[PDB]
Design a binder for this molecule. Structure first.
Ligand SMILES: *[C]C1=C([C])[C]=C2C(=[C]1)N([C][C]([O])[C]([O])[C]([O])[C]OP([O])(=O)OP([O])(=O)O[C][C]1O[C](N3[C]=NC4=C3N=[C]N=C4[N])[C]([O])[C]1[O])C1=NC(=O)[N]C(=O)C1=N2C#C[C][N][C]1[C][C]C2=C1[C]=[C][C]=[C]2
Ligand SMILES: *[C]C1=C([C])[C]=C2C(=[C]1)N([C][C]([O])[C]([O])[C]([O])[C]OP([O])(=O)OP([O])(=O)O[C][C]1O[C](N3[C]=NC4=C3N=[C]N=C4[N])[C]([O])[C]1[O])C1=NC(=O)[N]C(=O)C1=N2C#C[C][N][C]1[C][C]C2=C1[C]=[C][C]=[C]2
Lengths: 499, 494
């Protein structure tokens, strides 16, 4: 009933906010719609898999907040398998390689690929992480889709196809669905192209032993009966001295402040009194989440390793249901498994099939890519289509269609009277991921602490010490990578020598 | 409590559905979130204006359903003033003209303008009204914004600027915000470029005497206590024999079927049990409404008429708060007024100002465009910013960003168990307008009648006889309009 702060949403962000406030001595309540905490993280446990992350899973260097929170809760990480060769499957053929990027041999295609990634990061440097709408060319970039940008930048189909796969994989959306400004911000605020795409030294380096769901679960353990499950919030009334928060199951909660720790668009599920300001009212109708099915196929052994394949496959082409896989085998070497994502339009298209039909398609794909009949012999299968989730809206995160980030972006984490906004979408570093969830939850909590006069203004945003367990190697480039011309750059160079 | 059909939303679509079901002998309840009916229509009454439409207002030829429904309810229309000259204000100068289209005199510009409008309609002919995702090039066109299309098609800045204004005015959204497929469908399903843009013989020909709000009000009068105001729906449960509909004010309604007559995205405000199917679950997060402030400045006299101006202004350029106006003077010739729309990003930008500040900006603009100091002497002002409305989400209607219509469009009016979908967004003719609201409400009602075995399948969709009061003249083109080359066409010929 009565408390200091109501946190709407018991995902990592809401739980991190609640924990910080609780630790500070405030009385907090977490109102969670589902019969579980964790939200876009979910760790299934059964005898066949032991445990498996069906939602958010990967953590890595530079994600120091999630690493610190998890460590404090008694969790450990392990390294995703990248010992053996990666595979790039292009035009029906597999090409093994090493390093974050698939190598390209054609001199022209090489220049084009090199220029694409370089330009993505170049453009990124012009975009403030905490205010992407302040980029010098914000409007120009926001008024273009990523498809238009790729069409302009890529002088080869090879680069365009790989860039497209990259976008689909990064933000579970099609290149024509998303703003170029927003996508460029998204990559930059994850530390750039190399950091976001890498397993070793990147966002996919590690997973939590026992699953990421433990983060939210262990915070719930700490908070006890303060977490209220199956309490979807339907109504927030700020017309009186204390904020009134009502749930679907007919309960009323009274608080000094509220943290909204749900995906921005899911704010639509709440009726507000007084109405939201115009900009937020419209913003929450303009910000969809992406589409993805996370699929894990289990095998007797990690047979790919015997062929000097680590389990990573970058698979291009419309026919492939999954465009990207990672080895999901336990650190102990058992429960051998391949994790694959079915992305964007394919999540929509293939949702029509049965679980068994999807398993068959994945195994047949993997058999071809790995050149291994063993891939046709799965022992178990688990999957989760996040598009079906009423209380998520999709995964991994919210994307911005053209024109929206510049017009409505500044509204995202602007308080509405006594409502403050958490959720990974409001983060400024690794927004979209578990790291961003922690950053945003703790920042929102500290905004309330400041509002109560408990901390100074300069303590709202707090730096995080680097993990000792997961140190970050710097992202480096070669002289040639920095200075090799683009394709049009080479053509202009030829033109001047001709003239 | 218990009834045959619960209609969620008491706008024109919900009211039209409820009326049809009521007339058929079913027990209906309308659950309306606001303290009023009408939704995206709202007629304000006061001494200063008598009445004024602050939402949907215009009707015209080919909109036979809204005209028939209004007539039955005892309403009449009158013609929007288009006797005198229209004005196109370009690069700081006013150019008076007659006919629906502002003329162009540069020959290359003429070819470009002609080709643009022609191509819009050409493309439209390949788009099925009831299934735009079935267009032969549906994916190609859906994966482009209108901005990209205009960039490809328009070889002149003049054409591109006017095309942009057209998009902004049509769908209260920026060219880069919207799918080309969806926009081309939108225009085509309103009868094409000429029909949608025209006052005389088009969508802006007429208004209702006394206001369009009377449509929803008079149906509420007919239905009596069946309409429940300040009942926002929060929860729909379909797990049991009868559908359970719960409201915010703690009431429970039980019905055999439900009609959702709210903007698609506002379905998000309802918690569903069981959850919605995947495609609808995501669809309702992908479909925003546009942004507009409707502004009416009142004057002592319709002074523009004295200068042989009808009051229609098409105003190019970023600086102008309002890109389009119409004379809003009463049929009697009193309550002289100019109606203007503040569109898309300008609605966002100018919302920051006070009502008085917007009035000043509009009056100064009108003084410039009309070349009249009389425009600086308003006697009254009314405005409505639809972006602020929790239970609308915007106006005039829902737009589809690139990629959405092809991926999710088929979901729009697909029933979910015992929930059927009305609302202007689900119409196949004049979707977005009051006409579409009536079409969709009556179709949704008839889907339920068919589900109950009361009517055959072929009666779900019903043709509408042409209004005798507002007959439609055909849209015609000249030989030269049809056959003159585009700019690249002329270049290839050279
Ligand atoms: C789903 C997913 C997947 C499948 C995957 C992934 C993910 C996801 N991610 C993301 C994560 O998960 C996120 O971010 C997080 O989790 C978030 O958090 P937050 O913010 O907290 O949120 P949430 O969870 O959602 O929560 C919320 C809550 O609330 C609630 N509600 C609602 N509504 C309501 C409520 N309550 C009350 N009332 C009302 N009304 C709900 O229920 C919930 O609970 C991720 N992340 C990370 O970190 N990691 C990972 O891994 C992930 N994932 C993914 C990834 C991928 N990656 C890839 C690979 C390769 C590559 C890539 C990318 C790029 C490049 C390369
Ligand atoms: C806003 C607006 C404006 C400003 C303008 C306009 C408009 C609008 N429009 C549109 C109309 O209005 C519409 O369409 C209608 O109205 C719709 O209907 P419906 O479908 O029925 O829907 P609504 O109204 O929205 O209703 C709904 C209801 O529901 C409710 N809710 C919500 N949620 C809920 C509820 N309930 C319970 N629960 C829950 N949860 C609400 O409240 C409501 O009530 C229009 N239209 C027509 O027809 N006309 C006109 O005029 C209009 N407007 C406009 C126009 C413009 N035009 C222009 C000029 C020149 C040109 C143009 C265009 C193109 C070319 C040229």
């Amino acid at each position: 009933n009565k408390c200091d702060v109501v946190v709407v949403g018991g995902g990592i962000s809401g739980m991190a906010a609640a924990k910080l406030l609780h630790d500070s001595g405030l009385n907090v309540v977490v109102l969670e719609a589902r019969d579980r905490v964790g939200g876009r993280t979910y760790t299934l446990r059964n005898q066949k898999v032991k445990y498996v992350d069906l939602g958010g899973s990967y953590v890595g260097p530079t994600q120091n907040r999630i690493l610190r929170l998890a460590k404090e809760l008694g969790l450990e990480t392990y390294k995703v398998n990248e010992v053996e060769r990666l595979i790039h499957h292009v035009k029906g053929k597999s090409y093994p390689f090493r390093g974050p990027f698939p190598p390209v041999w054609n001199p022209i295609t090489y220049l084009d690929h090199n220029n694409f990634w370089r330009t993505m990061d170049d453009m990124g440097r012009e975009i403030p992480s905490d205010a992407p709408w302040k980029a010098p060319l914000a409007e120009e970039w926001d008024n273009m889709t990523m498809k238009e940008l790729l069409d302009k930048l890529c002088w080869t189909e090879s680069a365009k196809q790989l860039a497209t796969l990259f976008v689909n994989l990064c933000v579970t959306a099609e290149t024509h669905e998303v703003s170029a400004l927003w996508f460029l911000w998204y990559v930059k605020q994850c530390g750039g192209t190399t950091r976001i795409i890498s397993t070793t030294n990147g966002g996919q380096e590690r997973k939590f032993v026992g699953g990421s769901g433990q983060v939210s679960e262990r915070i719930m353990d700490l908070l006890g009966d303060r977490v209220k499950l199956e309490r979807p919030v339907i109504y927030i009334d700020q017309t009186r001295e204390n904020v009134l928060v009502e749930t679907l199951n007919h309960e009323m909660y009274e608080a000094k402040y509220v943290i909204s720790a749900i995906p921005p668009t899911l704010g639509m599920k709440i009726h507000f009194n007084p109405p939201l300001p115009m900009m937020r009212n419209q913003m929450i109708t303009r910000v969809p989440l992406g589409s993805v099915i996370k699929c894990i196929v289990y095998y007797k052994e990690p047979f790919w390793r015997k062929k000097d394949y680590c389990g990573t496959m970058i698979i291009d082409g419309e026919e492939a249901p999954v465009a990207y896989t990672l080895d999901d085998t336990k650190p102990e070497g058992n429960y051998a498994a391949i994790m694959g994502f079915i992305l964007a339009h394919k999540a929509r298209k293939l949702a029509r099939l049965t679980k068994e039909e999807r398993l068959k398609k994945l195994c047949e794909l993997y058999a071809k890519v790995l050149g291994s009949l063993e891939a046709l012999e799965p022992v178990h299968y688990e999957e989760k289509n996040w598009c079906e989730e009423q209380y998520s809206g999709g995964c991994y995160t919210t994307y911005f269609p053209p024109g929206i980030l510049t017009q409505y972006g500044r509204v995202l984490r602007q308080p509405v009277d006594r409502i403050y906004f958490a959720g990974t979408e409001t983060a400024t570093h690794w927004s979209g991921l578990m790291e961003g969830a922690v950053e945003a939850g703790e920042r929102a909590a500290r905004e309330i602490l400041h509002a109560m006069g408990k901390i100074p203004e300069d303590e709202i945003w707090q730096s995080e010490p680097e993990s000792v367990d997961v140190p970050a190697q710097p992202i480096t480039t070669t002289f040639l990578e920095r200075h090799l011309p683009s394709v049009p750059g080479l053509l202009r160079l030829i033109g001047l020598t001709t003239i």
